Structure 1
Amino acid sequence: MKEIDELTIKEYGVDSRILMERAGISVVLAMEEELGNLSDYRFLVLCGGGNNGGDGFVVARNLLGVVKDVLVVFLGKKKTPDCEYNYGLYKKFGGKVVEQFEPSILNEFDVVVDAIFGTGLRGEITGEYAEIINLVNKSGKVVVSVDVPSGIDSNTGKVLRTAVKADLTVTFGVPKIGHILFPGRDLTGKLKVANIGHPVHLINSINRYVITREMVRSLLPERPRDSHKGTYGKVLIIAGSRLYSGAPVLSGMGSLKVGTGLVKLAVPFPQNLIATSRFPELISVPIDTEKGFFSLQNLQECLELSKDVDVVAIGPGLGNNEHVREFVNEFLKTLEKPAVIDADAINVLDTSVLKERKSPAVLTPHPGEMARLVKKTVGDVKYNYELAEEFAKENDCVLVLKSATTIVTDGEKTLFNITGNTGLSKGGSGDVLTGMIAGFIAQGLSPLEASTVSVYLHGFAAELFEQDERGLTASELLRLIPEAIRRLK
C-alpha cells in the first residue's frame, strides 16, 4: 500500500494532493453514513505532522461552515508537503488551529477525528501524544480514526504502548493487517474501506486477504441433481481413545454436515459405540487396542481402511504418548491420501514426515499446539502470519492457525478469517472444524480451498446461535452448519 500510493502517484500520474483530498472526503461521507446529519455535531480534529494529519486537515476543511464547530489540534513539530498544503487550505478557509492540548478541551466537542498517526507510526507512543490518546480513550466521545487507530502497528495489529480505541475507522484502498489481527482488530471498531482512486489492478494485486462471503460462495462445491453418495466422497477419521470418546463424533458429524457422502470413524473399542449411539448415520469401526490407545499394532488395519476413502483426518482425541507417536508417524509416512492433521496427531508429529510425503496435508493447530510443534512460545507464534507462511512453504502443507482471527496459508497465499465469536473458545469446536475440512476435500476442493471455506462457515455457524454465545456447545454448532450454508447462498 506504501507501494500502491507511490506507483499511483509516480507511474500513473495521480497528484498526491488528489489522493489526499479523496481520502479526506471519504472520511466525511463515512461519518455521515454512521452519524446521520453532521450539521448538529462539534468536531475535534487531532492532526500529526505526517500525511495522516494531512488527511485530517482535509476532513476539517470540508466540515467548515457545515457543522456546529470544528477545531484542529496540531500535535506535530513539522509538516510533510501535503500536510502543509492542506493546513494552508484549512486556515485560508477560516479554520482554527491550536498547537497546545488542554484536557478540558474534549468537553466542548462531540466527535474526535483521530488523524495523529497512520501507517507511518514507528516505535512506542510516549509523552504528550500518549497523554492525549489516553484522554481521548477516557472521554466517552465518538472517535473516528483516519486510516488506522493511532498506535496500532498496521503490519501486525500490535499496540505500540498505547492506541486509540475507535468507534469507526476509515481505511484507504485495502484493509491493513493491523485491522484484521488483534488487538488492532478490536481498537478499529467498525471498519470502512474507501476507494480513493487507486487503479483497481493495483488494489487486486494484494497477496494477503480477508475471506469474504463472495469468495466462499464461489468455492462451494456443486450439487448436481444426478448424483449419489460416491459423488460427494468418503472420509475416514482416525480419532479417539479411552480418555476422549466424544471427539471422533464431533469430527465425523462435521464431515457429514458440510455434505460428504460417507464418513467412517476408526475409534478404539468400546468407545467407538458412543458415536452411533448419538448419531447412527455415522459408521464407527471398532479398533482392538491393548490399553485404549492406537499403536503400531493398528497400523495395518488403518492403512487398509484408508484404501477406500478420499481423505483421512487424524488426531482428535488420540492421546499424546509414545505408542500414539509411533503409530501416527508410521501411518502418515505410508498413507498416500490427503491428510488432515489435528490435535494430538500434531502434538506427536515428526515434521520430517511432512517433508517426505507426496500426498497433501492440512494442519490445524491452535497456538498452544503450534508453539510445541516449532519449539517457540505461544506469544511468539500467536498471529505470526510470517512464521505460518514459512512453515507451510517448508513443509509443503496448508496451515490453519486457529484464533479469533484465523490464518490459512499454503506459503504463497495467506487468507484471514474474521467470522465467529467467543462461543468457539470451548473444547470441541476444533474437532468439528477438522471434519469440515476433511469433508470439503472429499468433495473435491483443494486443501487450501477446503480450509478457506471451512473456517468461514464454522465461524458463521457460531454467529447464528440464537442465545448468548457463551452457552454455545459443539453439538449446537453442528446443527447450525447447514443454516450457515443456506445463508451463504
Structure 2
Amino acid sequence: MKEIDELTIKEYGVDSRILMERAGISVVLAMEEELGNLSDYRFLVLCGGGNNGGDGFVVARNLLGVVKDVLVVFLGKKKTPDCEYNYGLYKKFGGKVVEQFEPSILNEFDVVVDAIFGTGLRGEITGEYAEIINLVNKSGKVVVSVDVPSGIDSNTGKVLRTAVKADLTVTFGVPKIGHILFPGRDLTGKLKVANIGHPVHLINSINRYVITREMVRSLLPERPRDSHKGTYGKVLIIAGSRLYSGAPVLSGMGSLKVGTGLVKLAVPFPQNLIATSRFPELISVPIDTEKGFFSLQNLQECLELSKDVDVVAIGPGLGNNEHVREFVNEFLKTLEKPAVIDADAINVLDTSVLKERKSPAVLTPHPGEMARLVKKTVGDVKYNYELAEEFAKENDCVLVLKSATTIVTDGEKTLFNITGNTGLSKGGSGDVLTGMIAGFIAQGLSPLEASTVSVYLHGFAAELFEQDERGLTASELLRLIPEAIRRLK
C-alpha cells in the first residue's frame, strides 16, 4: 500500500495533498455514520509528526465551526511536508494546537481522534507517547483511529509495547494485515475502508485478501436440476480409533452438509457403528484392526476404497503411534487422489511425502500441529502468514492454518478468514471443517477454492447459533451449515 500511494502520486500524478485531504474527510464522514450528527461532540485530535498526523490535521480542520469544540495536541518534534501544510491550514482556519498533553485534558472531550502513528510506526512505543496512549485507553472516551490504531504493527497485527484500543478505525484503500490478525484485529474495533482515490487497478493488484461474502457466493458450485449423487462427488474419510470414535462422524456429516453426493468412512470396528447409529445416511465401513488403530495391514483395503472416490480426507482421531505413522505415510505416498490431511495425519506426516505426491493436498493444522510439523514454537508460527506461504510453496500444497483468523494459502495467493466466534473453540469443530473441505473438492472446486469457501461458511454457521456462543457444539454447527449456505445468497 505504501507503493500504492507512491505510484498514485509519482506515476498517476495525484497531488499528495489531495490524497491526504480525501483521507481526512473520509474519517469525518465515517465518524458521522457512526456517531450521528457531530455538532454536539467535543473532539481531541492527537497528531504525530508524520502523514498519519497530517491526516489528523485535516480531520481537525474540517470539524472547525461545525462541532462543539476541537483541540489538536501535537505530539511530534518535526512535521512531514504534508503534515506541515495541513497544520498551517488548521491554524489559518482558527484551530487551536497545544504541544503539552495534560492528563485532565481528556475530561473536556467526548471523542479522541488517534492520528499519532499509522503505517510509519517503527519499534516499541515508549515515553510520553506510551503514557498518552495508556491515558486514552483508561479514559472511556469514544476513540477513532486514523488508518491503524497507534501501536499496532500494520504488517503483523502485533502490539508494539502499547497500542490504542479504538471503537472505530478508518483505513485507506485496503485493509491492512494488522487489522486482520490478532491482537490488532481486536484493537481496531469497527473497521471502515475508505476509497481515497487510488486507481482501482492498483487496489486490486494486492495479493493478500480478506475472504468476503461475495467471493464465497461466486465460488459456490452450481446445482443443476438434472443431477444425481455422482454429480456432487464422493468422499472417503479415513478416521477414528478405539480412543476417538466421534471424529469420523463429525467429518462425514461435514461433507454431507455442504452438498457432497456420497460419503464413506473407514473406521476401526466396532467404532464404525457409532456413525450410522447417529446419521444412517453415512456409509461407515468397518476396518479390522489388531489393537483399535489403523496400521500397515489396512493399507491395501484403504487404497481399494479410494479407487471409487474423488477425494480422501485422513487424520481425525487416528491416534498417533508408530503404526499409524507407517500407514499414513505409505497411504499418502500411493494415493493418487486429492488428499485433505488433518489432525493425527499431520502429527505423523513425513513432509517428503508431500513433495513426492503428484496429486494435490490440503493441510489443515492449528498452530500446535503446524509448530510440530515445522519444528518451531507455537509463537513462531501463529499468524505467521509468510511461513505458511513458504511452506505451501515448498510442499506444493494448500495450507489452512486455523485460528480466530484463519490463513489459507497456496504460496501465491493468501486469504484471511474473519468469520466465526469462540463457540468453535471446542473439540470437534476442526473435524467438521475437514469434511467441508473434502466435500467441496469432491464437488469440483480446486483445493484452494474449497478451503476458502469452507473456512468462511464454517465460521458463519457458528455465528448463526441462536443461543450463547459458548454452548455451541459441533453437532449444532452441523445443523447450521445449510442455513449459512442459504444466507450466503
| TM-score > 0.5, shorter chain as reference | yes
- CA offsets per residue over residues 215-246 of structure 1, 9 Å max, x none? 00000000000000000000000000000000
CA distance in 2, matches of 1:247, 1:299: 20
What displacement does 1:464 show?
A: 0.0
Cα deviation code 1:19-45 (max 9, x no counterpart): 000000000000000000000000000
Shift of 1:344: 0.2
Q: Residues 242-282 of structure 1, C-alpha deviation per residue, up to 9 Å, x if partnerless?
A: 00000000000000000000000000000000000000000
**CA-CA distance at 1:451 after TM superposition:** 0.1
Q: What's 1:247 paired with?
A: 247
Match of 2:39, SS state, is: helix
The structural deviation recorded for 1:86 is 0.2
Q: Encode CA deviations 1:393-445: one digit per residue, 9 max, x unaligned.
A: 00000000000000000000000000000000001000000000000000000
Shift of 1:349: 0.1
CA distance in 2, matches of 1:311, 1:360: 10
Listed as ranges, the matches of 1:399-478 within 5 Å are 399-478=399-478
Deviation at 1:361, TM superposition (A): 0.1
SS in 2 for 1:13: coil
1:293 counterpart SS class: coil
Aligned pairs for 1:343-358 (under 5 A) are: 343-358=343-358
Deviation at 1:79, TM superposition (A): 0.2
Task: Say which SS state the counterpart of residue 485 (structure 1) adopts.
Answer: helix
Identity percentage over the alignment?
Answer: 100
Whole-angstrom CA distance in 2 between matches of 1:330 and 1:11:
55
CA distance in 1, matches of 2:234, 2:209: 31
Give, in whole Å, the separation in 2 of the partners of 1:358 and 1:239: 23
Give the aligned partner of residue 138 of structure 1.
Answer: 138
Distance in 2, Cα, partners of 1:51 & 1:397: 41
CA distance in 1, matches of 2:221, 2:409: 20
1:51 is displaced (CA, Å) by 0.2
Per-residue CA deviations over 1:267-315 (Å, capped at 9, x if unaligned) read 0000000000000000000000000000000000000000000000000
Structure 2 SS opposite 1:281: coil
Q: CA deviation at 1:141?
A: 0.0
Q: What do the CA deviations read for 1:156-180 (whole angstroms, capped 9, x no partner)?
A: 0000000000000000000000000
Shift of 1:5: 0.2
Tell me the secondary structure at the aligned position of residue 444 of structure 1: coil
- SS of corresponding position for 2:101: coil
Q: Distance in 1 between matches of 2:326 and 2:52?
A: 56
Separation in 2, partners of 1:56, 1:75: 12
Cα separation, 1, equivalents of 2:330 and 2:433: 25
Deviations 1:81-134 (A, max 9, x none): 000000000000000000000000000000000000000000000000000000
CA apart distance, 1:7:
0.2
Partners of 1:67 and 1:252 in 2: CA distance: 59
- What is the CA-CA distance between 1:470 and the residue it aligns to? 0.3
Equivalent-residue separation in structure 1 for 2:477 and 2:20 (angstroms): 46
Shift of 1:347: 0.1
SS at match of 2:320: coil
Equivalent position SS for 1:112: strand
- 1:258 maps to 258
* Alpha-carbon distance, 1:138 to partner: 0.1
1:341-400 deviations in whole A, cap 9, x for unaligned? Answer: 000000000000000000000000000000000000000000000000000000000000
Cα distance in 1 for residues equivalent to 2:195 and 2:146 = 14
Aligned length: 489
* d(CA) in 1 for partners of 2:322, 2:185: 41
Asked if 1:74 is matched to 2:74, the reply is yes
TM-score in terms of structure 2 length: 1.00
Structure 1 residue 74 displacement after superposition: 0.1
Q: TM (normalized to structure 1)?
A: 1.00
The aligned residue for residue 372 of structure 2 is: 372
CA displacement, residues 55-92 of structure 1 (integer Å, 9 cap, x when unaligned): 00000000000000000000000000000000000000
Aligned-partner Cα distance in 2 for 1:61–1:373: 54
- Hey, which bits of structure 1, 4+ residues long, moved more than 3 A? none
Structure 2 residue 157 is matched with structure 1 residue 129: no
Give me the whole-angstrom Cα distance separating, in 2, the residues matched to 1:203 and 1:407. 21
What pairs up with 1:272-311 in 2 under 5 angstroms? 272-311=272-311
CA distance in 2: counterparts of 1:363 and 1:11, whole angstroms: 42
Q: Deviations over 1:184-215 (max 9, x none)?
A: 00000000000000000000000000000000
Deviation at 1:322, TM superposition (A): 0.2
Q: Describe the SS at the equivalent of 1:245.
A: coil
Structure 2: unaligned runs, 5 residues or longer? none
Question: What is the CA distance between 1:473 and its match in structure 2?
Answer: 0.2
Alpha-carbon separation, structure 2, partners of 1:377 and 1:98 = 46
The aligned counterpart of 2:165 is: 165
Unaligned runs of 5+ in 1: none
Structure 2 CA distance for aligned equivalents of residues 235 and 20 of structure 1: 53
Give, in angstroms, the shift of residue 449 of structure 1. Answer: 0.2
Hey, what's the Cα distance between the residues in 1 that align with 2:252 and 2:63? Answer: 58
| Deviation at residue 48 of structure 1 after TM alignment | 0.2
* Distance in 2 of aligned mates of 1:246 and 1:483: 24
2:22 corresponds in structure 1 to 22
Output the aligned Cα RMSD: 0.2
